[PDB]
Amino acid sequence: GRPDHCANTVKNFLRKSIAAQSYSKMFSQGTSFKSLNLSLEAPSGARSSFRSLEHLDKVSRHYISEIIQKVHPLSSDERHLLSIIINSNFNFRHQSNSNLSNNILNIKSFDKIQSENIQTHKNTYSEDIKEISNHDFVFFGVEISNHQEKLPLNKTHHTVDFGANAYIIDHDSPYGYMTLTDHFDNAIPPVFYHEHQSFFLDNFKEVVDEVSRYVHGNQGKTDVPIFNTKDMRLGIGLHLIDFIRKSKDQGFREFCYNKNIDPVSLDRIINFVFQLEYHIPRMLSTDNFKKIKLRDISLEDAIKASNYEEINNKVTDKKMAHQALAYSLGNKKADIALYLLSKFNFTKQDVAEMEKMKNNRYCNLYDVEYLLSKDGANYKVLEYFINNGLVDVNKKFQKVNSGDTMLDNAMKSKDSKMIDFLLKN
Amino acid sequence: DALKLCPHEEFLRLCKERAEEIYPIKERNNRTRLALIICNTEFDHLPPRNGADFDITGMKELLEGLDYSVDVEENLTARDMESALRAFATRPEHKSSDSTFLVLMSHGILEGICGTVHDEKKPDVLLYDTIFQIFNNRNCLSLKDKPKVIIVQAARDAVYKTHVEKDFIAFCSSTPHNVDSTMGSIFITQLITCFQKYSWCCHLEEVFRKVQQSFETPRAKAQMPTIERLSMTRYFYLFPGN
Amino acid sequence: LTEEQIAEFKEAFSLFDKDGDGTITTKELGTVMRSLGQNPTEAELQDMINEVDADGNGTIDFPEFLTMMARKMKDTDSEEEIREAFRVFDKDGNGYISAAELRHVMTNLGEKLTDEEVDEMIREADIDGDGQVNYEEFVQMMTA
Numbered sequence A: 001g002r003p004d005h006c007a008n009t010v011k012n013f014l015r016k017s018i019a020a021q022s023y024s025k026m027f028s029q030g031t032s033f034k035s036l037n038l039s040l041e042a043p044s045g046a047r048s049s050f051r052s053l054e055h056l057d058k059v060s061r062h063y064i065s066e067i068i069q070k071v072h073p074l075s076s077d078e079r080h081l082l083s084i085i086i087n088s089n090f091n092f093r094h095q096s097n098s099n100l101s102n103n104i105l106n107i108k109s110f111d112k113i114q115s116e117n118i119q120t121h122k123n124t125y126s127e128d129i130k131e132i133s134n135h136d137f138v139f140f141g142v143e144i145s146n147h148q149e150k151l152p153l154n155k156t157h158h159t160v161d162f163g164a165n166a167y168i169i170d171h172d173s174p175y176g177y178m179t180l181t182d183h184f185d186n187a188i189p190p191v192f193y194h195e196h197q198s199f200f201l202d203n204f205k206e207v208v209d210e211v212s213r214y215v216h217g218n219q220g221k222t223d224v225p226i227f228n229t230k231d232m233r234l235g236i237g238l239h240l241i242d243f244i245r246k247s248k249d250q251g252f253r254e255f256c257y258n259k260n261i262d263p264v265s266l267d268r269i270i271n272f273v274f275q276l277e278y279h280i281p282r283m284l285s286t287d288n289f290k291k292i293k294l295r296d297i298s299l300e301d302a303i304k305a306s307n308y309e310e311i312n313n314k315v316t317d318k319k320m321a322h323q324a325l326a327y328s329l330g331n332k333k334a335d336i337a338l339y340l341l342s343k344f345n346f347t348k349q350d351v352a353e354m355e356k357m358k359n360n361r362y363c364n365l366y367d368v369e370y371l372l373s374k375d376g377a378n379y380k381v382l383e384y385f386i387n388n389g390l391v392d393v394n395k396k397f398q399k400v401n402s403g404d405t406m407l408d409n410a411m412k413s414k415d416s417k418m419i420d421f422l423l424k425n
Numbered sequence B: 001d002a003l004k005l006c007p008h009e010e011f012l013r014l015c016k017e018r019a020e021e022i023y024p025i026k027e028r029n030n031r032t033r034l035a036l037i038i039c040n041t042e043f044d045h046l047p048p049r050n051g052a053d054f055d056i057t058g059m060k061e062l063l064e065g066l067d068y069s070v071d072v073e074e075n076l077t078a079r080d081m082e083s084a085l086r087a088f089a090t091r092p093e094h095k096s097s098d099s100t101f102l103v104l105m106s107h108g109i110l111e112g113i114c115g116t117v118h119d120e121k122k123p124d125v126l127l128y129d130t131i132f133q134i135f136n137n138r139n140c141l142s143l144k145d146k147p148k149v150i151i152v153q154a155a156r157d158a159v160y161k162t163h164v165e166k167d168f169i170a171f172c173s174s175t176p177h178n179v180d181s182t183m184g185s186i187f188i189t190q191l192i193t194c195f196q197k198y199s200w201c202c203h204l205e206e207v208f209r210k211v212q213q214s215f216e217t218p219r220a221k222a223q224m225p226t227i228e229r230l231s232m233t234r235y236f237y238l239f240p241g242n
Numbered sequence C: 001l002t003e004e005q006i007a008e009f010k011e012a013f014s015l016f017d018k019d020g021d022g023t024i025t026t027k028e029l030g031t032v033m034r035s036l037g038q039n040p041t042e043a044e045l046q047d048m049i050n051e052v053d054a055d056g057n058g059t060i061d062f063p064e065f066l067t068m069m070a071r072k073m074k075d076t077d078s079e080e081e082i083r084e085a086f087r088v089f090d091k092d093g094n095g096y097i098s099a100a101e102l103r104h105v106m107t108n109l110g111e112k113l114t115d116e117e118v119d120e121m122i123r124e125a126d127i128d129g130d131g132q133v134n135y136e137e138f139v140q141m142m143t144a
Helices: A003-028 A031-035 A051-070 A076-086 A110-117 A127-131 A197-203 A232-246 A250-256 A263-273 A299-305 A308-314 A318-330 A334-343 A348-355 A361-365 A368-373 A376-387 A406-413 A416-424 B008-017 B052-065 B078-089 B092-096 B128-134 B159-164 B186-198 B204-214 C006-014 C026-035 C042-051 C062-074 C079-087 C099-107 C115-125 C135-142
Strands: A090-096 A105-107 A137-144 A165-169 A177-179 A277-281 A284-286 A290-293 B034-039 B069-074 B100-105 B112-114 B125-127 B148-153 B168-173 B226-228
Touching: A003 A051, A003 A277, A003 C079, A003 C099, A003 C115, A003 C135, A031 A127, A051 A232, A051 C006, A076 A232, A076 C026, A090 A277, A137 A263, A177 A232, A197 A250, A197 A263, A232 A250, A232 A263, A232 C026, A250 A263, A299 A308, A299 A318, A308 A318, A308 A334, A318 A334, A318 A348, A318 A361, A318 A368, A318 A376, A334 A376, A348 A368, A361 A368, A361 B052, A368 A376, A368 A406, A376 A416, A406 A416, B034 B052, B034 B078, B052 B069, B052 B100, B052 B186, B069 B078, B078 B100, B078 B112, B078 B125, B078 B128, B112 B128, B125 B128, B128 B159, B148 B186, B168 B204, B186 B204, B204 B226, C006 C026, C006 C062, C026 C042, C026 C062, C042 C062, C079 C135, C099 C115
Parallel strands: B034 B069, B034 B100, B100 B148, B148 B168
Antiparallel strands: A090 A137, A090 A165, A105 A284, A137 A277, A165 A290, A177 A277, B112 B125, B168 B226
């Protein structure tokens, strides 16, 4: 009844609206949804109503009913495991090579980053962005939390290490959604690709060849189960008990049906049988988080992630700055390149020494002028290199596409700004 | 370093005893072996191909360890690819050479490889038959009766040909666009390693067969590389280090 | 107001009747409720269990469960309540709230949240880019 209560209702409403926009994008721009009878109409006006959220709840109810009818009678061990998973809370992990956390951890979605850069044109849309359109969601791996082992229990999602820094949150988001695998890839790999394969190889048998299986709804393959935050635990548990009943390894069955099952063991089982993926709409900004540095990162991964801290630590000499600027131009990270150009003063002899770099991939393969002209993103640094006279405009390439000049790369990328710049200079 | 070299005495012995069964080798002195790598990474109307730089560098270093001078062309249209191959075939260093390698890497269809400005509504493709025509015994006298190796990596009457398209071999990979590594390709990586460890003792096709055997796992048998348009009648020992 | 084909609660309930009795145990109530995405406190659980037959040893039938879920679902905030919560901060009576007014409300009142989050939700409230926020229109647009 206090004014705080009304402000809380207001902000809950606005967060609901943000999530509604994200889910409307996903359900209207997703081509795979139309074949599965799960598609949704586009927003009539500028924004979308809560009908995307009720559609999310409807498809969650659909998948819950599909898995409940598959096993309506439940045994005692099945229901005991179901209660264990229903009452267990999750940790959600996002891995990146970038520094996403200071006093506060702020992770943004793909679409938010696009809208923030305000690049003039839209490059060709990738298949995932088109088939699932989950690109306004921050993605997370899922682990069990009632453990006191080292916090990153699992370090790989779809056998991919998405970064050295692991950011972990311990609270469910009210408007996130869970899938049993990747929303794009609905297949789990063989055992040789699983991180914690040693435990299962040592203690379990036929599950090794039973675990690699398309996890799909009754509509068939490519039917990815979607569960909302309220229904996720039940769906996870029911699909898990379906798989366990299908399994012939009695050891695995009685391990996952142990009444006093270990939480870390349960996480191993859920990371084995499934590869759960959690999605929080648009941004994720909180003060309650844990940051774990799993490993050191390479200078090139640092340039790609724009991790200025690791860059400054690793780039201390001009010979290392040559590598850094090469990796910046090759990976089209113009701002990092300009930071390096201000912090280190580069001369023409520096570019000559960069041309001789055989350790670096980009400079050993390509001419530096080629690297400057390849994409419009490097325009600024190109400008810097030409206004400061570090490279001559009419220089003919001697490594890749020999005989061509930077004007040719400009005409390939169809960037009129680069063409005008090169023509007048 | 990784490329194992064939001992010189074995080179002499195999050239003497099985000369009628292998392609002749020009002396390292005054030899001008050339190889060409065409690779399209950025496309106007198609998804980008990443990790191609790793494959370019690996293929370049391997071909140079095999004593080939490598030309590398990137982001070319189909017409520019045809012109580049035609120019390479009229390169006259091939007269002082004994073989050639053509590594073509891009997206592709069944009929040919895709250029940069390619779309389903207006296609931009270099046909494989065009490639084999440009280098046949009639249009490329410098490489007549010399082995011609075409490594292709793609994603997603005519009897005259059988008389003029001689001494060709094609090793083709057709792994889909996204299946893997952003730091390489499994086909190019396996090829480089098999060359590095088996070129010293086995001929080109034996190395190709060992690549194929490396793809015999149940998870990789689907993307097995294929040997196509074999016009060879002798065996090509690359005799590395000689 | 009233429930409609949300009797799918029964499905969840039926996953937890060990016997065909159609009877869950009191000890399981919370669990079953958490199966439906609800997080009842121990006080609410005790109040619900005392309403149901206390004498019977862990005997809750689906009629009683559905009666409890009826209130649990009818206690969700309504559209007009959200509209009133908006109007609490617009003493102008104009029907609009300044973007800075809403920002001050969210920074110095309610549950604390990061400034980037308040920026995102101010962007959501500020459709046109102007200082105005038509709360009536916005909440009506969001409620289908």
